[PDB]
Subunit: 472 residues, 3 copies
Amino acid sequence: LNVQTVAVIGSGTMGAGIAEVAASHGHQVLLYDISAEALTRAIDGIHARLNSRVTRGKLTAETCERTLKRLIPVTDIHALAAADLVIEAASERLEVKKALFAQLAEVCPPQTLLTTNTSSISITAIAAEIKNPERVAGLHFFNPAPVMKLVEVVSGLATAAEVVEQLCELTLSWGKQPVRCHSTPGFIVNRVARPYYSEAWRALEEQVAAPEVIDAALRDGAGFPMGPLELTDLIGQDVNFAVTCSVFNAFWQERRFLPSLVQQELVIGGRLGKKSGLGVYDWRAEREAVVGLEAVSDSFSPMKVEKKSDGVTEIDDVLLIETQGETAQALAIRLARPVVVIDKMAGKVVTIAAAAVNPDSATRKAIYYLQQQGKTVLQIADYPGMLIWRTVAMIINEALDALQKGVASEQDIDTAMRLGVNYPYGPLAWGAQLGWQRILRLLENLQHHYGEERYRPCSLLRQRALLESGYE
Amino acid sequence: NVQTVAVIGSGTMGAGIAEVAASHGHQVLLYDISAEALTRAIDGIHARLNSRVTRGKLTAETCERTLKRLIPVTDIHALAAADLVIEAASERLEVKKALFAQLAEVCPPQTLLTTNTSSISITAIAAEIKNPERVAGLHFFNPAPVMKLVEVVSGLATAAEVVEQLCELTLSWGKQPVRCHSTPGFIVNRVARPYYSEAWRALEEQVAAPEVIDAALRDGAGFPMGPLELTDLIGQDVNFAVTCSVFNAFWQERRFLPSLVQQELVIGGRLGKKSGLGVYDWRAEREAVVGLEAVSDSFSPMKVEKKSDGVTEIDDVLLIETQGETAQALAIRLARPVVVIDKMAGKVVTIAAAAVNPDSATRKAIYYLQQQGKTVLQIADYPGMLIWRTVAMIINEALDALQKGVASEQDIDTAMRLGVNYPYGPLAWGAQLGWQRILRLLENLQHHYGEERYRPCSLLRQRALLESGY
Amino acid sequence: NVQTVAVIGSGTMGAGIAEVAASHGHQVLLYDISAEALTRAIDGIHARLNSRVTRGKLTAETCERTLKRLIPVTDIHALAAADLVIEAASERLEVKKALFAQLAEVCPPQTLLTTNTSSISITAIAAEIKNPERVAGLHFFNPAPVMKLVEVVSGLATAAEVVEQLCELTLSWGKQPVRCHSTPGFIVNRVARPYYSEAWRALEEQVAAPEVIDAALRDGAGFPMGPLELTDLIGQDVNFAVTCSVFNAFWQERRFLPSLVQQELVIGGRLGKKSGLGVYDWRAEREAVVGLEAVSDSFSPMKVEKKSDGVTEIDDVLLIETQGETAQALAIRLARPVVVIDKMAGKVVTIAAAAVNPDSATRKAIYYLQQQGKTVLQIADYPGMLIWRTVAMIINEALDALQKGVASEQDIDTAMRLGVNYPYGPLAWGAQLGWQRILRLLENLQHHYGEERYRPCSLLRQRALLESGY
Ligand SMILES: [Cl-]
Ligand SMILES: [Cl-]
Ligand SMILES: [Cl-]
């Protein structure tokens, strides 16, 4: 590895942020754009952000000043002939990039690495007509580049393995964490994250719960840093929907990547979230706190509580059953007893559903029991698989499918989800913890209930459930 | 409070709408770009109102006063007097956006702006215009004077008072309105898809001649017209374009899948009645549906006994009401001759014999049916047959509409009763036919075909579980 | 009686079709608008037929006699004498519709008007054409003089008299006609899809190297060429395009899904033999697959006993022919080591070890097979494996085309034998392999993958129930 001079193409948020990372680590950076005004603004931004870090003592004055000196604005594409690495982050349109990379093939030596920050375009299609296709690769950073640790190092069909190793070593040296993946739709992060959003839209379309309740279960129950619906409001409905539709279409309309009419409606209505003041939520009025059910009195206490195995607690005559994807109602008529279905992980927020056939006294016994264990009990509709378990199962299923299709290694899939979108466990590590047979049973029940190919357990999930029963 | 009504576009539906508005007291400001097409359309209304005066439904005094309320215009700035605008122009996304942005400042701030669209989102149109809450869908059915239903379609911003206003207006026009949100196919065009689509599938697999399919749905199930003759009257191009529109708008959801058999009729210009040819030859006389000849009194059964689960045994044979399994599947399993029956209230009955039946065994089943005064049409051994399969799918679709918050249960039933003249509303019809019965049929079809198309929706499962507890 | 023949088009298929008609005693009006291309087409026919007079495959008297019958023309009005027109021009639907309209005025009402199109509907072409009942498809395969199959394609208007004429005519050209309706992929391009698609799926999951996949199908199943090397020879772009075309025309039916793997090669310009690299490196010679090495006689079986057919007990181990369940699934359900085998008639066999197997147990099974004289290829524990999975899907696809009335059983079988040179016609093959076996395998794959793609079609369930009698 001998990457010295780095060229960054584009003066937007990503280009400027990528330039900052490269220059802050000792590289001469050629920041290229055709507009000299644009370059000046982008460079003023970097100046301003780094100077405020020195103010707060988060960066030395020396490293600040040495960083700024390495940022060289250029308007002539020929100046990039000196670069060992070009990182492109300008127009997302395919034909523009193809034209850009064709131009860089003649300008630069054939040993210069030519990379793109794109999230949406095939590397293979970028690298298709250009001179030495083997040194074309994806180097995919996340907003904001100076803060986010993850980069996806993306191989196109032609991408050499030495090029991947060089790019991994270099981003390691920039204090990043590279993960490798092939040029398949959504890479790792945009692909595996999809059911986090789409399970919520489905819940929302069926009025299972208020959006605040869905977000509270996922954040304060499952441990995600932000609920999926609020996160779509903060990403911007237009942006998140465009990613969904893109992955959906690039997989020739796979129903596990189906878009939502609820989301579509918000986009075409211009209700894009925080940025426009209204989305799923109103961003003018400040955020309310989800309460949970008031304490049931000590007089409503159960006479006999018996924790059985397989997520069953028997409370007098009430079965409190952790969701396997069957409704409280189906269980209650099968077993001729009242049933409360619970959806819980480690967090304090817990969702529950009572079978319609429950007398309210039986439901209250179960609510009391839970409250006396520290949990905030939120009541929702009797929805198969509920919220937390339904969403995490589908996230894990998608991670497993990506692993099976050779998108990336198991460890790189876990890392990507931990760093790119801050999931509290990588999905594969999460599945091992939660139990493969348990995830399998749930998805099979969902698949049966809905009769949708969307809820199919993937072949590697069945494979891992079978291995797990082998150790049992 | 609406006085003057603007009706934009001079099409078939635009003319029928203007007639409804006029004959209920409203002064109608009819718009088009072509001034020659204006007088063309009004004289169409003149021609149609000269035959309803001859019957005695309207006197010639009120007839003339109706015709004098229709005022043709060609300038769009002059419509500032209209309290209500009803768009029925071209079905293009930019045709509507430009018109409504213009009508933001031409029309008053509180003037209700509606559209008769079958296929464009209301939210899409109301996006970049000034006052969003007064924009809606007012969806009439062909022909607008005769069909009693309008769908009042909310966009995302449409206010509930506006919804109420347009409901109050259509009520006053002899119509019965229904509320739905802006989702593909609204209520009527969505819930009715299986009526046609199942018939197309039957045809493709040559289950029966088209007349047999139409007779089964008409004089068996109780529909005013069979789905195939209906598509010939609607026009193949029109019905096929709605099927595709709904299919594409749900991102290719396979229970809305189009049919190659219909596509061939369209691309070959066989558009139905209007072109003289579609499914049927409309340039010739129609031979009525036969029904098998009666069998002799010597072929009479000895023993007849009704059993539980829609089975009646007749000698060594079994006449089984269809649960979605084939007669052949039932005959090899139960090791006895089986004939499967597809029937509701009407005289017309379809049947299938298991290929393993001796002809004598089948004739006994035909005889018993004939001795109940029923026309017996024999078709292929087809999972779910014709009537039960179709109605089960219509009901499934109705339940998914309800589940997804498109409209209320009573409104959905009203929509199918008045938008397409179904004998009962599907949700009421499901309760009468039995939810467990509907569920078990669709599961058997889901098993037989392995298609997501035939998936019981979640709400059906829920209601079947509730029914099992009564 | 057909005498004069008009061919329109001067490319590969245009030349070929002209060559066929000329050599069988027909005056051939070769049409193009260009005169430079017309000469270059005749030069190619002259080059090919003269390289066969020198190679002792044709006589000079017959060669010169054939090459005289080739009359190049640029005026479309010159085609008025033609008893039959065969079109093979540009595949845009507009240009074809415009040319065929022109032709009807120039030629008599009884002149047969045909096209060599693989992907455009005959009913669309015949829509606004005088006397449309004499319009059909005449679909030849590259290379036209070599390939024995012709698909004779009915539009909705195509007459039964015209079909007979074209069948009798093509028969007289030393060809074999098959009759089918105008539906996507006709017979051959539709039924052949899973041959390619299963291979791509195996590659995406890294089940085995591409050579191994190709050797299983060629030397184990008896296909003349394995699917992957065949796509390299067809051209990755051409094969992908047909896959996509069929997929889209069936409104995105999952049975016809394209592959990201093949897409990546097309997009990356690795189009196969024609550009030096596709799936395989054609710039270097390729070794045959070895197969596993001889296991020593120390792992000799204590006792060999054929258990219930499909299942063979070897002491510790069970050798189980694939029925769609993984070696691992069986291993833990039978509480015994399992080796799954995927075999038909050729020497080449694929096997998969269950992960729970001790390596000595697996070797016992390997030894046992090697001593039967078979090449053993070890691959991943893949549901349905390669041969049986592929053939079952080809059989399922042929059954679907049969029940949708695309073509008769014998014609489907004939079309696969002569169009793509398959060792057996799929429908005959399926009876020989047994319907219930094919049924059970597809059901096991459908359950495993939860995909509509692996659904048994309706006709397959019917034939499996029929097979359980006798
Ligand atoms: Cl996103
Ligand atoms: Cl319609
Ligand atoms: Cl091909």
